[PDB]
């Protein structure tokens, strides 16, 4: 389940397509919680490609639904990232993950 909440600036037209190494200023967030991951912290905005299931389904589906420049806001469900599994110490099981996603991509 990917619900997109776009902060309006962007272009609306340049979608990431298959195998395209696209660049995201993501800034993760726990629901009723603090941050857990941020490409703004590492300052390398995570040049990942579409269609290899590198990222979760809550963020891979969110990337194609966004275009260049767009600043959406994800709400990833439990069953797309870590609901059944849960990461030890970081993201528990049954977790509804939150993201500040801005798509200033390449390719």
Author numbering: 1 to 107
Study authors write:
In qualitative agreement with the experimentally estimated association probabilities, the binding interactions become favorable from state 3 (“S3”) onward, becoming most probable at the FINISH conformation. In the absence of an associating Ca2+, the energy of a transition from S1 → S6 increases, corroborating the experimentally determined trend in Fig. 1a. Notably, the energetically uphill motions of opening the Ca2+-binding pocket in the –ligand state cannot be captured by brute-force targeted MD simulations, when only the START and FINISH conformations are provided. Information from at least six structures along the functional route on the energy landscapes was needed to identify a thermally accessible pathway by MD-based piecewise free-energy simulations (see “Methods”).
RyRs are calcium-activated calcium channels critical to excitation/contraction coupling in heart and skeletal muscle. Ca2+, ATP, and caffeine are well-characterized activators of RyR, synergistically activating the channel by inducing a rotation of its activation core and pore opening. We use cryo-EM single-particle snapshots of ryanodine receptor type 1 (RyR1) to exemplify the discovery process facilitated, and the new insights revealed by our approach. Broadly speaking, conformational changes along CC1 involve the cytoplasmic shell, the activation core, and the pore; those along CC2 involve only the cytoplasmic shell.
